[PDB]
Structure 1
Amino acid sequence: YNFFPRKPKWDKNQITYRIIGYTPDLDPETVDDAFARAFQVWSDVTPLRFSRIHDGEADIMINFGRWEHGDGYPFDGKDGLLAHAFAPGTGVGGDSHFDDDELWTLGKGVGYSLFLVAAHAFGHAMGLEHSQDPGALMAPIYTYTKNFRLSQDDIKGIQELYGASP
């Protein structure tokens, strides 16, 4: 496992998120659930607790975008970047954006599981860099699987930043 330079992390365990926009690819309820389950991956093994809000600035602002979408880190059409997220911090820190020039599914088709990409993206949003462990959620490659389970590399990494729940 790895961290960003200087190991940035959230200075509190209660973290807010907000879904600012949606994709036409999936029902909004499916999108919401995908994100909820992606956060639960991490709250399973840390004292981090993620609360949704529908107004104001959440710690983790979630949105879909295409090409240049307001942060000066443009997406690139279909293929290439699927999504990105910023390391923990104020403002754009923690924010997680998904390239809607990709087809968002739950893993089937010429497309990508929103749950799996979100879980990976949220790893970055929590302060994890890419892992050299190929079986890790934080591996730099997307691999689809029907029954996802957080690897020991991911667990050890995230807990080195936040500890385990008592």
Structure 2
Amino acid sequence: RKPKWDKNQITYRIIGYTPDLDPETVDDAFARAFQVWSDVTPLRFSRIHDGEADIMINFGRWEHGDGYPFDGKDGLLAHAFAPGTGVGGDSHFDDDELWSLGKGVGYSLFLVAAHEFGHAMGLEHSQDPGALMAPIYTYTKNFRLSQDDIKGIQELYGASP
């Protein structure tokens, strides 16, 4: 009934950056976001620096060339497409927002990314208020995956070796 990736080897590339954080910190917040899923499944993520990747990462504001617009400060935060060719799997983040690692003021890039990557793997929203896949953003200092999230991703790719 649902679409998923054919093999467990997926590539990704950060083709656009934001002015709000150091490039090395951005690369780290994105890798940490992928690991939350690879720790409970057989999935493997490899970063490439040339050519097109399975999951293209980017930033944008308002219409950015895909029919699905953003909306300035606050409101929508980001979005991702289901497993598919071409644009499928791509994750876009709104740059009218202030990205940080939570706290002071802004939205945690690590938290929003972990959520969008669940989409790129084939997950939908969850009715569980405490789930990472819930539709609303909530900041928490000590993050941990809920049973609901673990149960859904393992249903699609199996459990961790």
Structure 1 segments of 4+ aligned residues over 6 angstroms from their partners:
none
Residue 72 of structure 1: CA displacement?
A: 1.6
Hey, what's the Cα distance between the residues in 1 that align with 2:142 and 2:55?
26
Q: What is the SS of the residue equivalent to 2:113?
A: helix
Hey, what's the Cα distance between the residues in 2 that align with 1:61 and 1:18?
5
Instruction: Give the unaligned 5+ runs of structure 1.
Output: 1-5
Q: What is the SS of the residue equivalent to 1:63?
A: strand
Residue 145 of structure 1: CA displacement?
A: 0.6
- In the other structure, the counterpart of 1:38 is 33
Aligned residue pair count: 161
- Provide TM-score, normalisation by structure 2: 0.97
What's the CA shift string for 1:32-68, capped at 9, x where partnerless? 0000000000001001111101111111100111111
- Provide TM-score, normalisation by structure 1: 0.94
What's the CA shift string for 1:66-115, capped at 9, x where partnerless? 11112121111111210000011101101000000111000123310000
Hey, what's the Cα distance between the residues in 2 that align with 1:98 and 1:108?
19
Instruction: Give the unaligned 5+ runs of structure 2.
Output: none
Aligned-residue CA RMSD (Å):
0.9
Residue 12 of structure 1: CA displacement?
A: 1.0
Q: What is the SS of the residue equivalent to 1:129?
A: coil
| Percentage of pairs with the same residue | 99
- In the other structure, the counterpart of 2:84 is 89
What's the CA shift string for 1:120-149, capped at 9, x where partnerless? 000111111110111111011111111100
Q: Which aligned pairs between 1:1-166 and structure 2 lie closer than 5 A?
A: 6-166=1-161
Range 64-73 or range 39-48, more displaced: 64-73
Q: What is the SS of the residue equivalent to 2:13?
A: strand
Hey, what's the Cα distance between the residues in 2 that align with 1:70 and 1:16?
23
Q: What is the SS of the residue equivalent to 1:128?
A: coil
